[PDB]
């Protein structure tokens, strides 16, 4: 029941989604090892993900969290990178998309920095790079990210450098406390707390 609606670059919706990609790029402490070396992207396509059943699954859970948290879903738009982007848009988020070895435990992880999510496009640590060239820093191959609606509800705040939420909470916020440029990262423990709104196809660009 998933259809993908192709957006025009003339559409203000495309523009604001792209602006969110580009402006949340940062340098990484691995010097580009996982995600490649780039300051910006070449956005090839942005598609809206329409799945009624997955959307209704999302809103049902959203209303539940909201009601446990003074009518406040605490909803964000966050990036997600994964080799399983394609299963996610058709079948939705579930336990097979969880990062078992993550620093905040076995859950599904999201990023405010698009470039953080980019490090996961080819696997943990960027795996072995793109399938074609085995290059983690490939400038040729097409990459895909999700820009997702995420229900955080009451988030356990964790200062720093599948399972359950900490009791009394609906998610975990990893606050950065070493790198002053890093944006927050987030973990949900139920697939229903995220909807894969936008599929963005792109290339990282070789810096000049
Ligand atoms: C274990 C698999 C391969 C399913 C997987 C693990 C972690 C991510 C993933 N982690 C992240 C961790 C922090 C911030 C953003 C992300 C992100 O955007 N993605 C994606 C897939
Ligand atoms: Zn490649």
From Swiss-Prot:
It comes from the Eukaryota. It is found in: Cytoplasm; Golgi apparatus membrane; Nucleus; Chromosome, Telomere. Zn(2+) binds at residues 130, 133, 138, 141. Ubiquitinated at 'Lys-48' and 'Lys-63' by RNF146 when auto-poly-ADP-ribosylated; this leads to degradation. Deubiquitinated by USP25; leading to stabilization. ADP-ribosylated (-auto). Poly-ADP-ribosylated protein is recognized by RNF146, followed by ubiquitination. Residues 8-208 form the PARP catalytic domain. Signal peptide: none annotated. Highly expressed in placenta, skeletal muscle, liver, brain, kidney, heart, thymus, spinal cord, lung, peripheral blood leukocytes, pancreas, lymph nodes, spleen, prostate, testis, ovary, small intestine, colon, mammary gland, breast and breast carcinoma, and in common-type meningioma. Highly expressed in fetal liver, heart and brain. Belongs to the ARTD/PARP family. Oligomerizes and associates with TNKS. Interacts with the cytoplasmic domain of LNPEP/Otase in SLC2A4/GLUT4-vesicles. Binds to the N-terminus of Grb14 and TRF1 with its ankyrin repeat region. Interacts with HIF1AN. Interacts with RNF146; this interaction leads to ubiquitination and proteasomal degradation. Interacts with NUMA1. Poly-ADP-ribosyltransferase involved in various processes such as Wnt signaling pathway, telomere length and vesicle trafficking. Acts as an activator of the Wnt signaling pathway by mediating poly-ADP-ribosylation of AXIN1 and AXIN2, 2 key components of the beta-catenin destruction complex: poly-ADP-ribosylated target proteins are recognized by RNF146, which mediates their ubiquitination and subsequent degradation. Also mediates poly-ADP-ribosylation of BLZF1 and CASC3, followed by recruitment of RNF146 and subsequent ubiquitination. This is Poly [ADP-ribose] polymerase tankyrase-2. The gene is TNKS2. The chain holds residues 952 to 1161 of 1166 of the full protein.
